[PDB]
């Protein structure tokens, strides 16, 4: 067999995003779950790069967010992508739950 | 037609041209966008005000 | 062999973790241990004064160095725990050895 | 009917095969989508890397 | 004299691999030539 | 072993061999199953049969004469076999009741008993002969809406709507004098056949058959006939090939001998010098395969055909085979070209130098209808020895590297993936 | 691992030599009884690692009387260690019973694998 | 889900009633053609969910001529939606062809499951 099916690590990628059997009549409402995986990656990456410049003391916390906005090189891009990304993360999750409430995805065996 | 190994046949020319153009496009798209922005807003930049206080 | 190669990666990430957290106390050993180590990367040919100025966030071991060392110290223990999961997957397909060093499929207990 | 009698595809087929017409226009568009993504993913990595350099108030006290 | 292997990669496929990294490195030199332009990295 | 053509108005070809014990005399026409429309389909299959019908073959057995016929694309044949001191009786059987007085064979009771025998041959073929009814669908889906796709036996409803008026309509347009070659092989001299033909004024009338409205054209397509109650899976797959009197005729035959044929239950078949057999035998992906190179006057087909019982690993057998086809463009070796030269000269020698004069009469009649003359086995051997590694790589990059395929299958073919997962395997993406 | 063809090529040259077998064979008999595998009721061919396709071939071709006896010696050697004892001296392997019973099956599985691999890498010209 | 025994217990009481079938059956025929499953070439029993052991029992006991025809109607209905079209009106399911072909196999699989379960919970005394 192929190397992507005999390796211990490559077979998990092959059995999930390469050779996974899908129903051929699903529509664009079944795309919301992959898009939520991209939303979690953007929130973790932009938050780790902002945690290098942040102070959590109650007399330094407000002014350190201002330091990221004014002093950090491309620091305004990091915050704006983080604060607006949380609203986009909640909008897709409201559309994800409403699809499964519509098409009956909660019933047995799921 | 008869241009395919000159264009996109080779595995190392399918990724060896789209990585080659990825820097040539990177600097000429950056220059032409900056040139358009500073003529749509001509007269308001600091370069135009500093030449008025000469 | 794959079980031994994932183990070497865990050992490098555990050394990096203990170094980053020792610089967060900011004692007198913490400052001069971080000065000696970060000055070693200024000897790399043709790219030497760009890793060290990106590790410092400035011109010496200063306030941007301590703030970014704590944020990386929160993170690498969670990368180690994901390498531990991949470590036990490579163990499950072959099992353990024994002090005799021969096959053990003739006598097994749960 | 018979299984040797295939239905009609002339509603969607071309009137000329011309085997360089199909393999030139379908490699220009997939190639250009990978050229823009190479310059698109490069610019995002450099902006995250550039935030770890010296800030504006550090270079002022130099 | 039939094609020295020490394994399986022999002369019968390195004849096609000797110009294979003409642009297999040509494109790993060029693959870093993507990701190294804007933060300081110059060539020789 | 030399061939002699001599046209006195009628083409007469003959290869003498004075070490043979029998002799064949027949006539071969230059119109086959690729000269029909979809409503008189398989009408040449009813001209073979009534020539072999029981009242016609009882007359021939009373003089020691055997009958044989064959329907294909681009040609048909009607052969009379006998003893070498009796060939003048063989011409008199072809002259009467096939050429001159061919009306008593087309009765109402002889035709109706024959048609219901041809109706049960094609019905048993459609239910039992699975590796051969899949190769028929490969011609049916690659040349659809084009003359080269009609099946040589006809179909079950195109055979039922066929009356006696349709046969003379076919004979009037296709059994003419210029569309014909008279062959004789075995122990028979070339000059005794020529004088015995012109001892009378044996001839026909008109010539200039119809002129074949649509040309042939390849199309990338697939057809799937799944049957879950059958215990196996049969699959064919091909690309466009090299026609007859193409300059890459022997080059496409040498390329199929590189991959050859296989049988999993023969022990000496498992030891062949084929690099594909290393991946096949590790998990036992198939039972047999064979590579072919078909060629006609319009186009050809180059490919392979398999039959497997491992119905969950079908997509690995297609993956490993199509990866080895890529090596003919990029990394074919010189010891694989020299092995296929020796085996091609042995395979061509057993087809053209067998012992059956009926077999050599269909081979001689086709090459004189389509070229005017025969090519020797010494001249074909001189051409095969002059192929290099560069000629194979020049042919392969033109004909199979990143091209369209035609697929056909039946049985338990649920594990066969769709078109674009197979179509993308026609370029390695490592050159 | 080295190969058993290479080991026997070196090891045979020492034994058809009058001055080499003088020196090395007294050293080799001390290396055997300082290993201590005979005290666990084991021959040497039981100790060979078996997770490779040449060694899996040689274990199928073994006769099944010698295959049943080998499976009991291995089971007896696992139970001996978890009690941290040795076997009684009645049940040690003597020096005449430690025969290479698996070396002929190994050496011909390797000569067939070498011949198959040097016929896949061929440079015959005209 | 409710049961098919409970549905038919309620649904039969409406049909042997002169004033109830006056009101409800004109409403029920409008609910059918406002569902639109006939335009995809489907009967109603094709739509029933089948991941339960009572429904898996009734599908094995179906005759295999009706089992082959049901597998083609489902495949035809998946290809119809990904093109976002409807079938031609020649190939719609008429009102006489929508028969309960699977209800008799379902109702006897449920009566045997009820009888087995009420004989496992028994309080017979002396
Ligand atoms: C803020 C987050 C941004 C990212 C959100 C992504 C979009 C989420 C919207 C939810 C959704 O996906 O609903 C889709 C729904 C049904 O989809 P369908 O499969 O039946 O129709 C496929 C059709 O055949 C084209 O399919 P086609 O093959 O043409 O694909 C090309 C199409 C792709 O663009 C999209 O459809 C993205 C939504 O682009 C073109 O049409 C080319 C025009 C030249 O379509 C509808 O029923 C329309 C209802 C409006 C939904 C509004 C949601 C309220 C918030
Ligand atoms: C506890 C919290 C849980 C969350 C509660 C719900 C939060 C509401 C979130 C708003 C987004 C949800 C709206 C869409 C819900 C999913 C609808 C759906 O899954 O698709 C159904 C329908 C598909 O069409 P059909 O498949 O029926 O076509 C016939 C084929 N034979 O497709 C449609 O009908 C789509 C029609 C357009 C829908 C959008 C209309 C506007 C919705 C209001 C949004 C208001 C935002 C401010
Ligand atoms: C956080 C770090 C680690 C954890 C949690 C971990 C965990 C484990 C566990 C649970 C086992 C099976 C039990 C056992 O055989 O003792 C094991 C075996 C093993 N570990 Fe680790 N390990 C770690 C680090 C390492 C390192 C640093 C190496 C080598 C450089 C390594 C190499 C191995 C090997 C080769 C085995 C198999 C040994 C055998 O089966 O005989 N591991 N490990
Ligand atoms: C049919 O059903 C589907 C299906 O539709 C899909 C799309 C998928 C595809 C799978 C997904 C979409 C899953 C998405 C995966 C995740 C959400 C994983 C979780 C992500 C993380 C844990 C992020 C990892 C953390 C980091 C990368 C840290 C980054 C920080 C950095 C790099 C800082 C570095 C610092 C310095 C100084 C360099 C399926 O598997 C699947 O089932 C078969
Ligand atoms: C929450 C945990 C998430 C679980 C992780 C699941 C997804 C992990 C897979 C993601 C892709 C990583 C695959 C690495 C590429 C394949 C590695 C490989 O070839 O296998 C190894 C290479 O050895 C290694 O050093 C592994 C390094 C791991 C690096 C981890 C970052 C080859 O092993 P082998 O040749 O035996 O393959 C079997 C053939 N039958």
What does this structure look like?
- This is part of a larger assembly, with two copies of chain A (110 residues), one copy of chain B (54 residues), one copy of chain D (62 residues), one copy of chain E (44 residues), one copy of chain F (431 residues) and two copies of chain G (126 residues).
- Chain A has 110 residues and is mainly alpha-helical.
- Chain A has helices at 3-6, 10-17, 32-50, 61-70, 75-102.
- In chain A, 63% of the residues lie in helices and 0% in strands.
- Chain A is extended, with a radius of gyration of 20 Å.
- The relative contact order of chain A is 0.10.
- Chain D is built from one helix and no strands.
- Chain D has a single domain (1-55), classed as Single alpha-helices involved in coiled-coils or other helix-helix interfaces (Up-down Bundle).
- Chain D is mainly α and 62 residues long.
- The radius of gyration of chain E is 17 Å and the shape is rod-shaped.
- With 44 residues, chain E is an all-alpha fold.
- Chain G is mainly alpha-helical.
- Chain G has helices spanning 4-15, 20-33, 53-60, 64-82, 103-117.
- The longest helix of chain G has 19 residues, at 64-82.
- Chain G starts with a helix and ends in a 9-residue tail after the last helix.
- The interface between B and E is small, with 10 and 11 residues.
- Chain B: The chain crosses the membrane at residues 15-40.
- Chain B: Belongs to the UQCR10/QCR9 family.
- Chain B: It is a single-pass membrane protein.
- Chain B: Its main location: mitochondrion.
Chain-wise SSE layout:
This is part of a larger assembly, with two copies of chain A (110 residues), one copy of chain B (54 residues), one copy of chain D (62 residues), one copy of chain E (44 residues), one copy of chain F (431 residues) and two copies of chain G (126 residues).
Chain A: H1 3-6, H2 10-17, H3 32-50, H4 61-70, H5 75-102
Helix pairs in contact in A: 3-5
Chain B: H1 4-7, H2 11-18, H3 21-40, H4 46-50
Chain G: H1 4-15, H2 20-33, H3 53-60, H4 64-82, H5 103-117
Helix pairs in contact in G: 3-5
Bound molecules: the ligand CCCCCCCCCCC(=O)OC[C@H](COP(=O)(O)OC[C@H](O)COP(=O)(O)OC[C@@H](COC(=O)CC)OC(=O)CCC)OC(=O)CCCCCCCC, the ligand CCCCCCCCCCCCCCCCCC(=O)OC[C@H](COP(=O)(O)OCCN)OC(=O)CCCCCCCCCCCCC, protoporphyrin IX containing FE (HEM), ligand UQ6 and the ligand CCCCCCCCCCCCCCCCCC(=O)O[C@H](COC(=O)CCCCCC)COP(=O)(O)OCCN.
The site of protoporphyrin IX containing FE has 11 residues of chain C, from helix 1 and helix 4.
Distance between the termini of chain F: 48 Å
Largest interface: D-F, 11 and 23 residues
State the total count of DSSP E strands of chain A.
0
Name given to the CATH homologous superfamily of the largest domain in chain F: Metalloenzyme, LuxS/M16 peptidase-like
Strand content of chain A: under 5%
Largest pleated sheet of chain A: none
Class derived from helix and strand content of chain F: alpha+beta
| SSE topology string of chain F | EEEHHEEHHHHEHEEHEHEEHHHHHHEH
Count of domain modules of chain F: 2
**For the largest beta sheet of chain F, what order do the strands appear in spatially?**
1-2-6-3-5-4
Secondary-structure element pattern of chain A, one letter each? HHHHH
As a whole number of angstroms, the C-alpha radius of gyration of chain A is 20 Å
Oligomer status: part of a larger assembly
Look at the helices and sheets of chain A and give the structural class: mainly alpha
From the alpha carbons, calculate the radius of gyration of chain F and give it in angstroms: 23 Å
Q: How would you sum up the global shape of chain F?
A: globular
């Amino acid at each position: 067999m192929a190397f992507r099916k005999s390796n211990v690590y490559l077979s998990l990628v092959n059995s999930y995003i390469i050779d996974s059997p899908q129903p051929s009549s699903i529509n664009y409402w079944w795309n919301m779950g992959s898009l939520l995986g991209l939303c979690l990656v953007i929130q973790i990456v932009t938050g780790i790069f902002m945690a290098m410049h942040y102070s959590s003391n109650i007399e330094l916390a407000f002014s350190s967010v201002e330091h990221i906005m004014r002093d950090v090189h491309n620091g305004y891009i990091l915050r704006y992508l983080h604060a607006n990304g949380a609203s986009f993360f909640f909008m897709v999750m409201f559309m994800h739950m409403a699809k499964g409430l519509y098409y009956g995805s909660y019933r047995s065996p799921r | 037609s008869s241009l395919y190994k000159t264009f996109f046949k080779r595995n190392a020319v399918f990724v060896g041209t789209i990585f080659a153009g990825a820097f040539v496009f990177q600097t000429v798209f950056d220059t032409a966008i900056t040139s358009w922005y500073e003529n749509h807003n001509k007269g308001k930049l600091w370069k135009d005000v500093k030449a008025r206080i000469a | 062999v794959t079980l031994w190669n994932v183990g070497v990666i865990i050992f490098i990430l555990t050394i990096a973790t203990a170094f980053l957290g020792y610089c967060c106390v900011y004692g007198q050993m913490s400052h001069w241990g971080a000065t000696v180590i970060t000055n070693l990367f200024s000897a790399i040919p043709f790219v030497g004064n760009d890793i060290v100025s990106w590790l410092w966030g400035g011109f010496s071991v200063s306030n941007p160095t301590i703030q970014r060392f704590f944020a990386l110290h929160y993170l690498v223990p969670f990368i180690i725990a994901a390498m531990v999961i991949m470590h036990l997957m490579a163990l499950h397909i072959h099992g353990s050895s024994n002090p005799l060093g021969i096959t053990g499929n003739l006598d097994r207990i749960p | 009917k018979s299984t040797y009698r295939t239905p009609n595809f002339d509603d969607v087929l071309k009137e000329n095969n011309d085997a360089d017409k199909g393999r030139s226009y379908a490699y220009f568009m997939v190639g250009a989508m990978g050229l823009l993504s190479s310059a698109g993913a490069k610019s995002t990595v450099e902006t995250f890397i550039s935030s770890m350099t010296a800030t504006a108030d550090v270079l002022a006290m130099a | 004299k039939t094609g020295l292997h020490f394994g399986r990669l022999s002369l019968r496929s390195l004849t096609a691999y000797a110009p294979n990294l003409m642009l297999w490195g040509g494109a790993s030199m060029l693959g870093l030539f993507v990701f190294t332009e804007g933060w300081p990295k110059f060539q020789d | 072993a030399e061939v002699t053509q001599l046209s006195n108005g009628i083409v007469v070809a003959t290869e003498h061999n004075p070490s043979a014990h029998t002799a064949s005399v027949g006539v071969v026409f230059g119109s086959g199953a690729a000269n029909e429309n979809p409503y008189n389909n398989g009408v040449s299959n009813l001209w073979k049969n009534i020539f072999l019908s029981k009242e016609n073959s009882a007359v021939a057995a009373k003089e020691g004469l055997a009958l044989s016929s064959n329907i294909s694309r681009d040609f048909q044949s009607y052969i009379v076999s006998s003893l070498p001191g009796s060939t003048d009786k063989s011409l008199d059987f072809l002259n009467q009741s096939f050429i001159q007085q061919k009306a008593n064979l087309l009765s109402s009771s002889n035709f109706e008993a024959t048609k219901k025998s041809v109706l049960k041959q094609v019905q048993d073929f459609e239910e039992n002969d699975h590796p051969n009814r899949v190769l028929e669908h490969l011609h049916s889906t690659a040349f659809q809406n084009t003359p080269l796709s009609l099946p040589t036996r006809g179909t079950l409803e195109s055979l039922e709507n066929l009356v006696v008026a349709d046969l003379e309509s076919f004979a009037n347009n296709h059994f003419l004098n210029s569309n014909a070659v008279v062959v004789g092989t075995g122990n028979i001299k070339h000059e005794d056949l020529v004088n015995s033909i012109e001892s009378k004024n044996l001839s026909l009338q008109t010539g200039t058959k119809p002129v074949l409205k649509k040309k042939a054209a390849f199309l990338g397509s697939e057809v799937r006939l799944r049957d879950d109650t059958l215990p196996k899976a049969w699959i064919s797959l091909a690309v466009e090939g090299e026609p007859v009197n193409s300059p890459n005729y022997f080059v496409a035959k040498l390329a199929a001998q590189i991959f050859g044929s296989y049988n999993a239950f023969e022990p000496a078949s498992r030891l062949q010098g084929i690099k594909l057999l290393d991946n096949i035998q590790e998990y036992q992906l198939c039972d047999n395969f064979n590579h072919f190179s078909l060629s006609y006057k319009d186009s050809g087909l180059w490919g392979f055909s398999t039959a497997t019982r491992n119905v969950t690993m079908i997509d690995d057998l297609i993956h490993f085979t199509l990866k080895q086809w890529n090596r003919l463009t990029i990394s074919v070796t010189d010891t694989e070209v020299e092995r296929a030269k020796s085996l091609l000269k042995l395979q061509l020698g057993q087809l053209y130098e067998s012992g059956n004069p009926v077999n050599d009469a269909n081979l001689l009649g086709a090459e004189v209808l389509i070229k005017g003359s025969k090519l020797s086995l010494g001249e074909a051997f001189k051409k095969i020895d002059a192929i290099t590694v560069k000629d194979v790589k020049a042919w392969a990059g033109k004909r199979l590297w990143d091209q369209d395929i035609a697929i056909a299958g039946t049985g338990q073919i649920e594990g066969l993936l769709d078109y674009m997962r197979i179509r993308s395997d026609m370029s390695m993406m490592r050159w | 691992p080295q190969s058993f063809t290479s080991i026997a090529r070196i090891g045979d040259y020492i034994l058809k030599s009058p001055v080499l077998s003088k020196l090395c064979v007294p050293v080799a008999n001390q290396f055997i009884n300082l290993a201590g595998y005979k005290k666990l009721g084991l021959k040497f061919d039981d100790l060979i690692a078996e997770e490779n396709p040449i060694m899996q071939t040689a274990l199928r071709r073994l006769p099944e009387d010698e295959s049943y006896a080998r499976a009991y010696r291995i089971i007896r050697a696992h139970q001996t260690e978890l009690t941290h004892h040795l076997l009684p001296r009645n049940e040690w392997i003597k020096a005449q019973e430690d025969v290479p019973y698996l070396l002929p099956y190994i050496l011909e599985a390797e000569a067939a694998a070498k011949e198959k691999d040097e016929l896949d890498n061929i440079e015959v010209s005209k």
